[PDB]
Each structure stands twice: as structure tokens, then as C-alpha cells.
């Protein structure tokens, strides 16, 4: 009755080599009718027991999967932009430390997450700032970065410092001129040491079409340089790595990375290239997203 | 959830809305009544119901008519508040200013906003409309460039109003002041600036607060414009400003500035200045002498000052 | 105008003397019917305004009322038997959640109240960087285990993903020599050392009126508790007793007690008492008059008793 | 959270829980033969269901029987190892120890607990019973007095067990050690100590971990008892301890300056226990495991592969 030693060797090929019961019967020359008897009776006590978890969390599993694959400090999987909004907001709430400098980008995504921050009763002693200039009309007002920065600060009962320059100027001499000003200096100065960043992700693939933004001439040229996505108007390729660069007021990615948490929030297969690039580039080290697009990134 | 407070609230309507007698109400509700007096009493003390008696209804009104008469204002409101704490004087004007503003707008209007403590209160107290009037909100001045708290920023104010008004809004992405003229000249060229200025040319109503030299607010002139420039201002005998346009105490009237011209502010059906002070009198007065404002929203003391 | 003085003068008597129209009409010698015309008007023209606050929050109000009356930094009144200790538990927990700052030292007491509040703290994913400790010794069998202070201290710490430091001495020893011997030990020194600088305390309130398992009779035994009634003791906290006027009452088990003194409890930023039931009114009052607690979590019912 | 995984769970349970096969499981739910397999594979891959194989079923069992034979243990469990790291070895024993413990209890039992990494992993793994078995939990030693992390405290362990067992519990309010005797004696005279000791006198089962000198894991002897006392221990030849009672590698009780300072169960009483289960592993705990067996201070032994073979030389 110590044929047990076999039940280990048998369930061995059954649950690891998965050679079927007709495959197990013939290779070790055993009656396929005796191949079936060993496994089952054992289940009475040890002799190999399998456990199945009833309360399992798919989303949670996907988060760990994302963290593993991309080396993210954290991730959250959830007009389901609102679901992202709520859980992202929680991630951001949990992450804040007194004395932090949070930076903000623009758009439906970041707004979604700010719209869901918790109203606080005392100052959280953090400081909100924009990490990019104004849309220059290119965005609706409720999506303006300053609106979002100010809105956040209001939920967080916190200091805020709005930017009075555009993200994109007509020529380098105007932009560098602006960079010389004590106000730009002051703003960037917070950039140079921001703790948490909170960011949307652009791609070539809605009103915020790179076409409608920088205008065809320029976007057709972005496609030429193999640009996967952009962040804060700083562009990267699919492996994570520009005519308007000499004309852009925004945080340099280099500085974005020194940031304890750089939390990207995005969704949709249309933005996979951008999301990927952003991940490969380490420009973001946290990801808020939906279930669907999370699976795309794991494949 | 709450106690029989609903019943209390209801009897509040009877006695206060319909001015019915306690006895009549009691018979109607089959309530023993004494219970009624008790409830009426409670509703009042627990701030379920709050009654307010404008004691100054008469003098404020008279003062409004004099201001109209002396300066030929289209409209004028004089708020007064016994609590002499300043943030309270502002709420006084804010509430009333807002009402004035609510009833003055007309479908299709372009509202322009300036910055500051005052314009802000007016906005804070705007009636939260349930349906869009089809109005549009715009800054009539570039950004503070860090010189003002965020809750006082011009965009903040514009956008915030738009919310109450269910109006679309258009935020400005340039500063109110530039260190150099070249940059200012270059910026005027941009399509964006052209679009925002495009609205200034057709502005229908304006909420505008008034600055003066005497201000000791952090929003001081030596603070905003810095030492040297403040002298050149007092050196030219300047009484005050609106959207950083300067004028003397008689109304009479920059290559770095990005804001609406007074020319355009005057073309406005209603230019509404809102201010209080006495250290602002110099500037309020100059604003009236120049008809840079049709309407004036202000408190009792300031009005007293402007009448003698 | 002129009838404007009267509208006021009438509104004054209707709303400030809560006189009846019949009365107003009478004193003044006005036809009762114009007294009514004049009220109708007074409101129509905004000389008189009547706000009925539809989204009124009774509990909310009671909280402010308690804060005002007793100078509390905060207070929470809740509503729903034990099912109502649970309402307290949930909202208290929120108060405590909102109040925590990184680097805080939370101290805990014992009993159904505190457990309830802790049972409802939010499970955290990272360490809140706070430290949980007991501010009292063990029950020495006098309490069920799920109410033991260490259980509660440890439980809290587990919800808060936080440091915790359990106490290995009893709250009450047979004679002073033992008690001071214990006080000489490095472990007692260490524990108390946290007491000497605890940020948030979280505490239940004892009283004589109680006849649940935690009867002072059962705990200290008759001889002792009869003598507490003699010294006019209203309540207790962490086995430190006070009178109805919040006066401390040295009690004779005083020299046999391992627990935080209250000089020390008070140095504490937030000392949050959590209690309810008219049977404990004396204790809650004393605790409030004594300033031993500066926050109150409680139910609606007992909140009303405290404003009476 | 669904939808498919809401489904993988359904299928998994029939197929595994109910033994129902696929061609018929697919029959029940109107889906595909290819698909059921796909789903099962997915569930296995994604961790919804995990299966475990006891490769070492044979050697562990033989080792169990030898331990019983050499030392006359009532029972013995050997969890597998050398395919695992420190904290994992514990879980290995914990799980199995727990099972051993679950089946040994009998209605009306008094369970006593000691402190430490080991006794804890046994408790962590106790089966969460749905109905009270009328057992009672008690410390068999006073508190650590700060010398141990909270999650290892004796009360923590007792109370935590009681939770799994739906048993009432009784926590101790005195330390396991007191520098000074006035204090210690004053405590033994208390109604409370008397009550807790009252239980030691009738103890039915005991979870107990073993200490040694060769320890170098925070809970060191120089650390717990301090410099001088550690010498007097090595000076007297102690091989190890159970509830701070000391003994030599032959089982004989060793006396120490401490005996008159200690507040814990006497070894006389631990032996009176129906089952006294020691749980330990580690070539450095050898000296102390062995002494515990030579003294029959433990009937049962829960331990890993490496140590098992060590005791069998
Ligand atoms: Cl808990």
C-alpha cells in the first residue's frame, strides 16, 4: 500500500508534464485503469492536496502583474474613466506626505483623478504646481492645467502656484526670454524638486489630436521621428527615448524622473504605444488604468 | 437621518411663508399647538430657520440714489454690515453685488473679470443657475505672475463664475506684465492672444475691482510693480487703476502690459467696479470721474466718503 | 418710505418678541389687517428675509453646540442598543482617521467603546508611521479578553499598519510597594515614556451609575466603590477619578495604580472621549469640565442631555 | 470583477470539487470542449486554483516514524525543507503543525501557549473553526517585558489562537521575569495569578517552542537575560529551555539565579499534559531540542527535514 511513492511520480507527470492518463499508462507500462486510482483516493489526506481560492481579485492580480513586468512602484487597475478616477485618487491620497510638492498635467484623465480627491478639513501641508504651460486655447477650460492644479489644491487645502506662460511659444527667442523671468524661474524651481507628479499620456493614435494641437506639418513630422507618445509635451519613441523642444515651457523628463512617484493615468488601445513608451522610459513609475488596457500591456 | 425636524420645518412654512396664525396652524395640524410655539421656537434657535432684518434699508437706498445722482451711474449698490471685521464687509457687498450682477446679464453676454479680493467675493455669491444663459466669461487681464494668491487669480475668478453661470469660459495664458516690451510685442501676435483680445472688443459686462496707491494690502503697488515703478506712479500723481491701466483723480489717463484698454472698457454696456476702502477713495473717485465704471458696488462708509 | 420705519418696527415685534399679529395690531393701534399687509410687503421687498435651511443636519448642529458649550476641538454625534454603539464606532473611527499625523503616538484605554471605535478604523496598505500604546495596565481578569487594552492597542496597530508596544503590568496592584517596584522597571519606564509625549489619546469613560460587567462594584469591590461615592466621584478615566466639577479626586487606590496621570493626558493634542447613555452623564460631564478630554464621540440622545 | 473569472470559479469547483468531468461539465453550462480546457488552464495559470504535490511524502513519513521510535514520541511531524528559505521553513511546519494540532484537541481542553516565531506560525495556520469546541486558551508564561516584538507576544498568540478556535481565552497580566522578588511574590499572591496558574495545573495541550544558547536571532540569551546571566547558563551547562525553565542536554532540570524571579509554568506541570507539543527547527537549536526529548518535556515534535535527520544520527 506504499504505492504512494508512485502517486507522487504519477501526479508528477499529470500536473507538470500533463501527459494524459493514456500517456502516463504507456510510458511506465501501467494499466491506464490503475493510473486513475492513485490520484483520487489520496485526496483524503495529503498525498498531494490542491487549494482553490474563492475570494480572488482579478484587478489586484493584474496590478501585481503590471508591477512585475514593468518594475512599477505601484499600479491600479479599475466613461469608465470615472472608475480610474476614483481609485487613482485613492492611490494619490495614500501616497502623499506632508511637505510634498505635487505637479499636475492636463486633460480628461488627470481631471478625472483630481475630481475624486478627498475633501480635507486641514491643510495637508503639500504644494500644488503645474508642470507645463497653458494650452493657448487648445483645450477646454475645465481641462486647463492651472484649473486642475488649483482644483486639487482646493480639495487638499493646500498651497498652489499657477503658471502664467504658455506651454508652446511661436519662436525660441520668446520662450527663452520667458525662461529668464523671475516667475518662470520660481515655477521651474518647484519642478527641480517635485515629490509626486500626476500625469496624462499623449499619443498619435479626440479634440486633443496632435494634429489639432501642433498642426499636421508638425505632427506628420512626429510620425517621421517614430514618436510613440508624449508627456508634458516631451516626446519619446516606443522604446522610450522635437522641433518644438526649443519652444516649450515644461518640466524636462530628466527632472520628472527624480520624482519619488511619477503617476501616469491613461487607458485605451489607441494609446498603447504611448503607455508602453512611457513605461519603457521610466518617465512614470506608477500606472492608473482600466482592466481592458491592462491586459494589452501584459500580452 | 433626522428627528421630527421635518415637521418643524413644515410648520415653519405655514407661520412664516403663509403668515398663518399659530392657532390656525394648530387646528390644521391637530397638534396641541403649544407644541407649535415650542417648535417654532426651536426651528429658529437651531439654525433650521434664520430670519434677517435689513435695518439699514433706508439709508443704503438713499445713498444709492445720491451716488447715481452725483456721478450719473447707471446702477449702484451700497452694502453695510455691523460686524466691522473686514472679510465681512466684503461678503456684504459680494452678496448684493452678485444679485445686481445676476439681474443685469442678458442672453448672449460677454462677461469680463479682473482679479482680487473684491471681484472674487462677487463671484462667490453668484446665484447658481440651473440652465445656461448662453453667456461667455473671459479675463480682461493677463496673469498675476505669482504676485497674487491662487484663489484671487483672474482665471480662477473667471472659471469660477462660469460655474455658477453655466457659461463657457476662456482662460488667458499670458501674464499681465512682461519685463520687456519685445516679449510683450511678440505675444500680442499670437493667435491665442488675438482670440482673447477678440472678446475684449465686444465685452458686454465687466466685474472690475479698483486699486489705489494707499493700499497697504500685500497687493501693494511697491509690491506688485516694485519700488522704482511705484515712485514714477506717485510722481505722476496717479489716483488709481483698473486692469493695470492708470488714471489721475480727474479721470485722465504700459508698453509692458497685457490687458484690456480703457477705451474698450468704456464701450461696455455695464462696467461694474466693486470696492471699499477710504484708502481707495482716491482711486474710486478717479474711476467715476472717468466713467470707467457705470456701476458701483460698495459699503456704507465708503459711500459716505464719496458724497462729501 | 416712512412706512419703512414701521415695516421694520413691526417685523421687530413679530420676530423679536414673537408677538402675535393680533397683539402687534393692538399695541400700535393699527388695523390687524394692515399689520398683515405690512409683513407681506416687508418680505416682498426684502426688508425682511426668511431662510429655511432645507439640507439641515441635526447631528451636525449638535456637534457645534457641544463644541461651543464645552470648548471642544471636535465632536461627533451619531445615530441609528449596541447597534448604536456601532454608529458611534464608525464616525469616531473617521474622526480618528482624519486626525492622525505621521509620527503620532496614539494611546488606548479599554472597553466596549474603544473597541467599537477601533473595530471600525480603516485597513491601511502602508504604515501610517504612528505608534500605538496602552495608557493603562491590564484588567487582571476583570474584563473579557476582546476588551483588554492590549488587545485593542494591538488591534488598532494592525489596522493602521503601525508600531505597537504592549504593557506587561496590571493596572491595579495589591499594595504600593509592589506598584512602585514595578514603576522602577525598565519596561514600565519605557511604556510611561511614550505616555509623557503621546499625541492622540483614545479613551472610554467610567461612572458609578454603570451596572454592566464593568461595575465599579465588581472591579474594585464595594468596600472601595462605596468609598468612591463618599468622595463625590462622578466618573473615571484610566482609573483616575474626578468629581462632577472636573476636580481630581485622589482615591486611595491612587498609589496602587499603573496608568497615565492626567497632567499627562491633557498635554495631548487630541484626547478623544467616547461614551454615551444617561447613566454616565455625571462622568461625561466631569470629564468635560476637567478638560481631561477635548473631543467627544457620542450619540444624539446623550448629546441633548449635555446641552440641557 | 467577473465575468469570465466569475466562470472559471464555477467550473473549477465542479471539476475539482465535484469530480464531474469536462465533456459533461461543458454539457451542464452549454459551452465548448476546447473552452473548458482553456479556462481550466487559465485558472491554473492565473492562480485562482493552485495544486500542491508532496514530493517528499515518503522520506518525511519515514523520518516521522524514526523520531517516534528513537524518542518514544506520541506523535511527530516533519515539514519539508532545503528547497526553501528561513521564513518559509516556518510556514511549512506551521501548516502541518496546525493540522496536527487541530485533530488532537478534544472538547473541554485547556490549551497553553508560549511565545515566539515558531509558536506563532503554528497559530497563524490553525483551521478557522465554525463552531466552538469548548476549549480554553491560556499563556503558560508571563509577558516578554518588551524583549519581544508584539506579534510574538504570548497573549497575542493565545488570543489569536482562541480566534481560530472560537475558544474563550485568558490573558496574563504579569511579566515572565522580575529582577526583584518582592514584586514577584506580591504578584503570585494575587487573585489573578492564582487564576492563571489554576489553569496550568490542569493543562490539556501545550504549544511550546524551544530556546537554546547557540541562538543568534534577536531572541538571544545574552539579549533576553543579559550578559552575566548568560554565562551562569553556559557555566551550568544548560542546553535549552521551555517557558524559561532550564535543562541540560540530558533532560535534567538546571536551576538558575532566575528560578526565583520567573513567573511561568513549572516543568512538573507541563509533563502532566496530555500532549505537549514542541515546535522547532535549526541546527543551532539541536542542543535544546534534544534535551527537551531526553526529558519528555514534549510528547510531540514539529520540525523540518534538516533537523529531523540531525536528531537521528
Ligand atoms: Cl481589529
From Swiss-Prot, chain A:
DNA-binding region (UniProt annotation): 21-40
Disulphide connectivity of cysteines: none
Gene3D superfamilies registered for this protein in UniProt: 3.40.50.1360, Homeodomain-like
GO biological process: DNA-templated transcription initiation
A GO molecular-function annotation: DNA-binding transcription factor activity
Keywords: Activator, DNA-binding, Repressor, Transcription, Transcription regulation
Record flagged with keyword DNA damage: no
Domain of life: Bacteria
Record-linked InterPro entries: ArsR-like_HTH, Homeodomain-like_sf, NagB/RpiA_transferase-like, RNA_pol_sigma70_r4, SorC_transcr_regulators, Sugar-bd_dom_put
Role: Positively regulates, in the presence of L-sorbose, and negatively regulates, in the absence of L-sorbose, the transcription of the sor operon.
Family named by the database record: Belongs to the SorC transcriptional regulatory family.
PANTHER family (UniProt xref): TRANSCRIPTIONAL REGULATOR LSRR, TRANSCRIPTIONAL REGULATOR-RELATED
Protein name per the record: Sorbitol operon regulator
Organism (species): Klebsiella pneumoniae
Gene (name only): sorC
Swiss-Prot record, chain D:
One biological process term in Gene Ontology: DNA-templated transcription initiation
Record keywords, A-Z: Activator, DNA-binding, Repressor, Transcription, Transcription regulation
Lineage: superkingdom: Bacteria
Entries under CDD domains matching the protein: HTH_ARSR
InterPro entries attached to this UniProt entry: ArsR-like_HTH, Homeodomain-like_sf, NagB/RpiA_transferase-like, RNA_pol_sigma70_r4, SorC_transcr_regulators, Sugar-bd_dom_put
Family note: Belongs to the SorC transcriptional regulatory family.
Protein name per UniProt: Sorbitol operon regulator
